[PDB]
Amino acid sequence: ALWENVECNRHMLSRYINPAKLTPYLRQCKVIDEQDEDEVLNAPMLPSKINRAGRLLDILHTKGQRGYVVFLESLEFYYPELYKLVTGKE
Ligand SMILES: [Mg+2]
Questions:
Q1: How far is the CA of 37 from the centre of ligand 1 (A)?
Q2: CA of 86 to the centre of ligand 1 (A)
Q3: Cα–Cα 20 to 30 A to 79, which of 1, 5, 15, 23?
Q4: Ligand 1 centroid distance, CA of 32 (Å)
């Protein structure tokens, strides 16, 4: 589906997204809630950052097309290169 664009790029996204930068906008757009944010931000920061945004992506995966579109806009705002990676923009 549409999510395949995120899933095939999950490795770059899970590493290079700092979830804390995205959650305010995601919450404001009502695609995640306070508890979602808590789970994402209160998750242990480890020596490896390879999966730091993994939990966030997995939550967003359950949030339908609204989740998908809002997430993409959050990349356009905050992670321009990752947005281009996801959408194929040049
Ligand atoms: Mg709370």
A1: 8
A2: 30
A3: 1
A4: 12
Go through the domains of the chain in sequence order and give each one's CATH number: 1-90 (1.10.533.10)
CA of 35 to the centre of ligand 1 (A): 5
Residues found in the chain: 90
Of residues 16, 1, 3, 2, the one with CA closest to residue 59: 3
Torsion of CA 33, 62, 73, 51, to 10 degrees: 90
Enumerate residues with CB within 5 Å of ligand 1 (an ion): 34, 38
Q: In Å, what resolution does this model reach?
A: 1.8
* Residue 44 DSSP label: P
The method recorded for this entry reads X-ray
Structure tokens at 55: 């939990």
